Design a protein around this ligand. Structure first.
Ligand code: ZN
Lengths: 340, 142
């Protein structure tokens, strides 16, 4: 147990500096030492990697490593991301050394000779490194070919295939932080939100909110994070399509009332003009009639637990603004009419 | 309904009239289906004066109920429609003088003095003469 700490941290440091362009002093000696250590780790993951205090101890060490670094400023180094990546740490290191242009020639040669001896060692008991790298190239080409010859961007994002992989990555990253319990998920989500492209992130969130559990703590954390942060939810309900938010809300009743408040507020900031028979907003970024009609139509074409809720939230806002029965006076009258 | 004192159904009925005047054309003499009305119910002067009439008739009901912004919108539209009626302007300038007098008031004086009946039907003439207030030019000289 303690024997493995100085091994693992040392390997993580060597790996992290591997990707860095200081590689001048490296030699066949360094690379051999690297790969023998990596063999030891790959063996460990195999031997006693499941169901013990050792697995959880290593996870603790890894996640503490990944949070003391965090991934801000001095280096956004991946590192081996999780306990499963121990089983292929040696491949990562190798890939990084092939990317380091600053690698010396004799080092590179010894390296490539140790990855690719040839078919002289076609018979091997352990799935060796050359097979692993060939099998990696295969998968990569397979992924490219499906994307450009078969794949189609599904409209029902939940059922698409890129988004559903991102989602499950995010969900794994929430579960790991929950078990870690060092810093709260809200912090992780906030940091994510600043770094990377927001509209993409939001699409992803929508779909992650719907994936069934893989042990619903994942979704349960995100609902709380979102209800805490209004601005994102302002851009959330603004960016996605209708049916997705409809399925979201039927799934999570905690999201229903606020979302209706958001829609109700966009209704109340329209004005009718008599010359063109259309509700319009004054400002340009105020949702147009068509989008607001869309969302309400999606919400009303839903399971009954939500249909009565949205319908009642609309009638109460109609009666609130004078109980007219004729168009040109109340956005809420025009909605209730454009439903029958 | 106004004269019987029912704000709600009044604004309702005015609105329904306003809808029919803009989301339909009366001069569709494309298909001669009958003894259509040749003259009284075709005149564009009748259409524009009636538009303005119903906008005013509505705007005053927002005022009576205390919804002066909606009233303002209706009077503005009426001004856009018939700028040579001056019944419009009395009501518009009365509202701006109540809320935000100076610049817009003088701006519409200038519009009037830029501006300065032909063959209407009789029911419309009598409706306009009826709703209009006696103290118009006095206020229009203020
Ligand atoms: Zn006629």
């Amino acid at each position: 147990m303690e024997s493995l700490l100085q091994h693992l941290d040392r390997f993580s440091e060597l790996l992290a500096v591997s990707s860095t362009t200081y590689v001048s002093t490296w030699d066949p000696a360094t690379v051999r030492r690297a790969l023998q250590w990596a063999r030891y780790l790959r063996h460990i993951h195999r031997r006693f990697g499941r169901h013990g205090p050792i697995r959880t101890a290593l996870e603790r060490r890894l996640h503490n490593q990944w949070r003391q670094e965090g991934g801000f400023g001095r280096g956004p180094v991946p590192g081996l991301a999780n306990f499963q990546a121990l089983g292929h740490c040696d491949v990562l290191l190798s890939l990084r050394l092939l990317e380091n242009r600053a690698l010396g020639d004799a080092a590179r040669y010894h390296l490539v000779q140790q990855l690719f001896p040839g078919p002289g060692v076609r018979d091997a008991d352990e799935e060796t490194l050359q097979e692993s790298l060939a099998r990696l190239a295969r998968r990569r080409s397979a992924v490219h070919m499906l994307r450009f010859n078969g794949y189609r961007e599904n409209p029902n994002l939940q059922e698409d295939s890129l988004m559903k992989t991102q989602a499950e990555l995010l969900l794994e990253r929430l579960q790991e932080v929950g078990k870690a319990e060092a810093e709260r998920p809200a912090r992780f989500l906030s940091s994510l939100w600043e770094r990377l492209p927001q509209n993409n992130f939001l699409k992803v969130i929508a779909v992650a909110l719907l994936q069934p559990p893989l042990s619903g703590e994942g979704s349960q954390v995100l609902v709380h994070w979102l209800l805490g942060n209004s601005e994102v939810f302002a851009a959330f309900c603004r960016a996605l399509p209708a049916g997705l938010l409809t399925l979201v809300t039927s799934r999570h009743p905690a999201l229903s009332p606020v979302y209706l408040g958001l829609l109700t507020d966009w209704g109340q900031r329209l004005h009718y003009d008599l010359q063109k028979g259309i509700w319009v907003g004054t400002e340009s970024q105020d949702v147009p009639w068509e989008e607001l009609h869309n969302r309400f139509q999606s919400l009303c074409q839903a399971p009954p637990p939500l249909k009565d809720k949205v319908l009642t939230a609309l009638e109460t806002c109609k009666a609130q603004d004078g109980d007219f029965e004729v168009p040109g006076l109340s956005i809420w009258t025009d909605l209730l009419l454009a439903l029958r | 309904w106004v004269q019987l004192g029912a704000q709600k159904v009044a604004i309702s009925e005015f609105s329904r009239c306003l809808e029919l005047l803009f989301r339909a054309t009366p001069e569709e003499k494309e298909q001669g289906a009958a003894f259509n009305c040749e003259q009284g119910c075709k005149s564009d002067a009748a259409l524009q004066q009636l538009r303005a009439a119903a906008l005013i008739s509505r705007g005053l009901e927002w005022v009576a109920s205390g919804q002066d912004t909606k009233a303002l919108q209706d009077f503005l539209l009426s001004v856009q429609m018939c700028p040579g009626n001056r019944d419009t302007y009395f009501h518009l300038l009365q509202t701006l003088k109540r809320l935000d007098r100076r610049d817009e008031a003088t701006a519409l004086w200038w519009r009037l003095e830029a501006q300065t009946l032909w063959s209407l039907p009789l029911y419309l003439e009598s409706y306009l003469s009826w709703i209009r207030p006696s103290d118009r030019d006095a206020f229009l000289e203020e």
